[PDB]
Amino acid sequence: PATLYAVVENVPPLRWKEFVKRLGLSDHEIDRLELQNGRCLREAQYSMLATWRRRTPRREATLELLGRVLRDMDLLGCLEDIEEALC
């Protein structure tokens, strides 16, 4: 969960969907995330990091898949900040 808060802050909100597209989650589910709760953008972005752990069958390394997305988006600096959150 703490890593999810880091990804929500380190990753930009406006381009979050693009970051989500790099995540590989169903594109249509991404649009539905706003319906789940758009009153709180952090809750929406958190929905991706939270719903992903639930909907995706990833037993562990949830940030790992996200980290690879960061590297593709040149967000390695952000992962280091997110990594600091875990530490």
DSSP 46-67: HHHHHHHHHHS--SS-HHHHHH
Burial (CB < 10 A; 0-12, 13-18, 19+), residue 14, is: exposed
Please tell me the experimental approach by which this structure was elucidated: NMR
> Distance between CA atoms of 25 and 21, rounded to whole angstroms?
7
> Distance between CA atoms of 31 and 48, rounded to whole angstroms?
11
What are the tokens at 67?
């980290």
Helix axes 62-72, 41-55, angle to 10 degrees: 120
Range of the domain at 87: 1-87
> Distance between CA atoms of 58 and 27, rounded to whole angstroms?
18
Domain count of the chain?
1
> Distance between CA atoms of 71 and 69, rounded to whole angstroms?
5
| CATH number of domain containing 30 | 1.10.533.10
Give 3-state DSSP helix, strand, coil % of the chain, rounded to 5: 75, 0, 25
> Distance between CA atoms of 86 and 30, rounded to whole angstroms?
26
Residue reference for tokens 């958190």: 46
